[PDB]
Design an enzyme around this catalytic site. Sequence first.
Site, PDB file in Angstrom:
ATOM      1  N   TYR A 198      -9.306   4.779  10.331  1.00  6.17           N
ATOM      2  CA  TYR A 198      -8.505   3.562  10.437  1.00  6.17           C
ATOM      3  C   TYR A 198      -7.319   3.671  11.402  1.00  6.17           C
ATOM      4  O   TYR A 198      -6.531   2.728  11.536  1.00  6.17           O
ATOM      5  CB  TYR A 198      -8.063   3.081   9.048  1.00  6.17           C
ATOM      6  CG  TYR A 198      -7.297   4.111   8.237  1.00  6.17           C
ATOM      7  CD1 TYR A 198      -7.926   4.849   7.235  1.00  6.17           C
ATOM      8  CD2 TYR A 198      -5.947   4.329   8.471  1.00  6.17           C
ATOM      9  CE1 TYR A 198      -7.233   5.789   6.487  1.00  6.17           C
ATOM     10  CE2 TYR A 198      -5.221   5.266   7.734  1.00  6.17           C
ATOM     11  CZ  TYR A 198      -5.872   5.979   6.739  1.00  6.17           C
ATOM     12  OH  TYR A 198      -5.153   6.879   6.025  1.00  6.17           O
TER      13      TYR A 198
ATOM     14  N   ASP B 113     -10.815   4.135   2.741  1.00 11.94           N
ATOM     15  CA  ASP B 113      -9.924   5.090   3.352  1.00 11.94           C
ATOM     16  C   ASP B 113      -9.853   6.442   2.623  1.00 11.94           C
ATOM     17  O   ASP B 113      -9.398   7.419   3.211  1.00 11.94           O
ATOM     18  CB  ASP B 113      -8.534   4.490   3.460  1.00 11.94           C
ATOM     19  CG  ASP B 113      -7.944   4.167   2.099  1.00 11.94           C
ATOM     20  OD1 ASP B 113      -8.575   3.412   1.312  1.00 11.94           O
ATOM     21  OD2 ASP B 113      -6.843   4.671   1.834  1.00 11.94           O
ATOM     22  N   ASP B 114     -10.330   6.507   1.383  1.00 15.87           N
ATOM     23  CA  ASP B 114     -10.093   7.688   0.550  1.00 15.87           C
ATOM     24  C   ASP B 114     -11.364   8.208  -0.131  1.00 15.87           C
ATOM     25  O   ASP B 114     -11.320   8.775  -1.223  1.00 15.87           O
ATOM     26  CB  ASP B 114      -9.047   7.336  -0.530  1.00 15.87           C
ATOM     27  CG  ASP B 114      -9.571   6.271  -1.523  1.00 15.87           C
ATOM     28  OD1 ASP B 114      -8.885   5.982  -2.530  1.00 15.87           O
ATOM     29  OD2 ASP B 114     -10.678   5.722  -1.288  1.00 15.87           O
TER      30      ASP B 114
ATOM     31  N   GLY C  87       0.763  -1.224   0.000  1.00 21.97           N
ATOM     32  CA  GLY C  87       0.000   0.000   0.000  1.00 21.97           C
ATOM     33  C   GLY C  87       0.797   1.279   0.000  1.00 21.97           C
ATOM     34  O   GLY C  87       0.244   2.334   0.278  1.00 21.97           O
TER      35      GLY C  87
ATOM     36  N   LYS D 159      -0.885   1.260  -6.249  1.00 19.00           N
ATOM     37  CA  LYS D 159      -1.317   2.530  -6.840  1.00 19.00           C
ATOM     38  C   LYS D 159      -1.176   2.565  -8.373  1.00 19.00           C
ATOM     39  O   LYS D 159      -1.865   3.357  -9.043  1.00 19.00           O
ATOM     40  CB  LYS D 159      -0.533   3.717  -6.253  1.00 19.00           C
ATOM     41  CG  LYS D 159      -0.342   3.691  -4.776  1.00 19.00           C
ATOM     42  CD  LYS D 159      -1.605   4.038  -4.018  1.00 19.00           C
ATOM     43  CE  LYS D 159      -1.367   3.819  -2.553  1.00 19.00           C
ATOM     44  NZ  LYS D 159      -2.531   4.356  -1.770  1.00 19.00           N
TER      45      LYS D 159
ATOM     46  N   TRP E 157      -2.716  -3.142  10.036  1.00 20.40           N
ATOM     47  CA  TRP E 157      -2.067  -2.642   8.858  1.00 20.40           C
ATOM     48  C   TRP E 157      -0.957  -1.802   9.482  1.00 20.40           C
ATOM     49  O   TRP E 157      -1.216  -0.683   9.997  1.00 20.40           O
ATOM     50  CB  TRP E 157      -3.010  -1.773   8.036  1.00 20.40           C
ATOM     51  CG  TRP E 157      -2.374  -0.983   6.904  1.00 20.40           C
ATOM     52  CD1 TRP E 157      -1.218  -0.228   6.943  1.00 20.40           C
ATOM     53  CD2 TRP E 157      -2.901  -0.832   5.577  1.00 20.40           C
ATOM     54  NE1 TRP E 157      -0.990   0.371   5.705  1.00 20.40           N
ATOM     55  CE2 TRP E 157      -2.010   0.010   4.856  1.00 20.40           C
ATOM     56  CE3 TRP E 157      -4.054  -1.324   4.926  1.00 20.40           C
ATOM     57  CZ2 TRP E 157      -2.224   0.352   3.520  1.00 20.40           C
ATOM     58  CZ3 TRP E 157      -4.267  -0.983   3.599  1.00 20.40           C
ATOM     59  CH2 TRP E 157      -3.363  -0.143   2.916  1.00 20.40           C
ATOM     60  N   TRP E 158       0.255  -2.377   9.507  1.00 20.79           N
ATOM     61  CA  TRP E 158       1.332  -1.772  10.240  1.00 20.79           C
ATOM     62  C   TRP E 158       2.220  -1.053   9.259  1.00 20.79           C
ATOM     63  O   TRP E 158       2.822  -1.695   8.380  1.00 20.79           O
ATOM     64  CB  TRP E 158       2.103  -2.816  11.042  1.00 20.79           C
ATOM     65  CG  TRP E 158       3.221  -2.258  11.869  1.00 20.79           C
ATOM     66  CD1 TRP E 158       4.535  -2.540  11.741  1.00 20.79           C
ATOM     67  CD2 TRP E 158       3.110  -1.332  12.971  1.00 20.79           C
ATOM     68  NE1 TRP E 158       5.265  -1.858  12.697  1.00 20.79           N
ATOM     69  CE2 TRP E 158       4.407  -1.116  13.465  1.00 20.79           C
ATOM     70  CE3 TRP E 158       2.032  -0.687  13.597  1.00 20.79           C
ATOM     71  CZ2 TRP E 158       4.675  -0.259  14.557  1.00 20.79           C
ATOM     72  CZ3 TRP E 158       2.292   0.182  14.674  1.00 20.79           C
ATOM     73  CH2 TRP E 158       3.614   0.386  15.142  1.00 20.79           C
TER      74      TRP E 158
ATOM     75  N   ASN F 119       3.036  -2.809   5.850  1.00 25.20           N
ATOM     76  CA  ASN F 119       3.235  -2.027   4.653  1.00 25.20           C
ATOM     77  C   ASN F 119       4.741  -1.789   4.429  1.00 25.20           C
ATOM     78  O   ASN F 119       5.421  -1.198   5.286  1.00 25.20           O
ATOM     79  CB  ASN F 119       2.468  -0.719   4.814  1.00 25.20           C
ATOM     80  CG  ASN F 119       2.344   0.063   3.520  1.00 25.20           C
ATOM     81  OD1 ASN F 119       2.591  -0.471   2.424  1.00 25.20           O
ATOM     82  ND2 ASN F 119       1.909   1.340   3.637  1.00 25.20           N
TER      83      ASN F 119
END
Length: 584
Positions: A295, A257-258, A147, A178, A354-355, A389
């Site tokens: 989040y 998230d967006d 991500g 992306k 989600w680290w 991530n």
Amino acid sequence: VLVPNLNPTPENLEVVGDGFKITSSINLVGEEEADENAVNALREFLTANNIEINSENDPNSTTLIIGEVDDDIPELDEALNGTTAENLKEEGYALVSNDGKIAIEGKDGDGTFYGVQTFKQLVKESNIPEVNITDYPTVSARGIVEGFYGTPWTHQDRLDQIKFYGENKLNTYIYAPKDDPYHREKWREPYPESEMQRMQELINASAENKVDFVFGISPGIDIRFDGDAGEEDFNHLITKAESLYDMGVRSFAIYWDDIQDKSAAKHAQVLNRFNEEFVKAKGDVKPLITVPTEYDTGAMVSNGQPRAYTRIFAETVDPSIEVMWTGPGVVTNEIPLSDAQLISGIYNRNMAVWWNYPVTDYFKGKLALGPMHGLDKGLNQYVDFFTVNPMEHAELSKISIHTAADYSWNMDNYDYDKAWNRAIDMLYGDLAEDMKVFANHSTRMDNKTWAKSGREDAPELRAKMDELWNKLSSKEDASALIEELYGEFARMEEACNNLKANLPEVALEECSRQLDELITLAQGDKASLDMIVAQLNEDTEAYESAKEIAQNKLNTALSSFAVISEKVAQSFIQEALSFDLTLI
Ligand SMILES: [Cl-]
């Protein structure tokens, strides 16, 4: 004789003999019945190490027996003698090497594959220790979410990462780059024919390495919820999931998230309807995954209570859906137990993490080369899904990822400093010690505003530096410290030069600028000691000359894209440049 470095650290391992050498060819037993992916990994290794498989039994060669429990292999139980994978969780295995025999038994095919992965790490130049092992993960889902922003991984990078994940028992890869329009800007559309071989290769490699290939979809750019437009778009979501299912995809993630339309009821409705009309209808789809618009804990929670979005999302979202969160902030020092307890309590389930380390997209000049750090060792109590991530730098990301494999599989016993050493020792061979000198200075991430995480850089060196200043400002003899620091700065330089000359290009192209920068800093660190000694010696000219170099080296560092050792090798020049022994 001795047990090599292992990753992850097996749950139970007992040395029960002095070890033996595996013969130049072996007897293989249980191949008809044993997990295919596991047998192939075994075959591959055997080949790579010039160990041949007998057509027929026993020139008195070593015997390797492979299978799952419940398989019909009477020889496996004999060889395992007492030890068993039957009472172990999913993905568990048992491995017994004793007196010319090696038994690998998985609880399931996944377990068998991981037992193979263990076996591979246990064998050094045909020599294997004599061990009893039973082993199984702490956390059910362990892996990577792709991500990060910045230059995407290549196709070849991804294929290599997937193999690397299997070798280290990571079972999850969330594909949501992306650079792939079909996950976002064209989320409604099936992959066209020209993209299918690429996608299939990733799906195929994931399956072969027991990696769950999770397709991440971000419809937030333009999804509609209201009325018939909403209806048509839910149906696009279904038809897109279907086209991914049809090429082999069995896990799915839907990100919120967006999105501009920040409506928790509507996000959770899409998820619940998708859980129902797709996940459940299919029967073999893993639990649905989601990233809610809030989040991290700061965005989710206010005065220990959920904010409205999180309150509604949590009360609406199906109990089976995995909900991801990043911790107390998006990029933060830690996840204490109390934070996981809080977010788990709000959602009434085990959470998914989600680290955001080793990801460096927010501070690209610096490489993140440290271990999992700040994550509570009791986290499994509230979390059963752990992802990191990583960096746009796929190759160097492997040092931190390595430690994440150890953390999520064997959490109770995770030792970030030993895990980190073992990561470098395992990845870098005869360059390990030089690689540690460099990476040691490149673990702490901090963009000076909202994002910070990681072990402090070179803690021991920073403590020696602190001692120097307090000796010099307390009229205590600092000669030994000065002598020692000269050795350490010279070593920084020697290690980085050997890395520039000998690292392979795949690693070098990621870090060559940070290497030159650590060299420059070591050189200013040295000039800084020269300044101190000149003051002790009351040699004004030697002082001015050393100062100019120290200043110059610091100026180069500050003017470079590459960033490293900010609080340590760099700060030390600044400290020295402001230090004046005549005032003590
Ligand atoms: Cl490894």
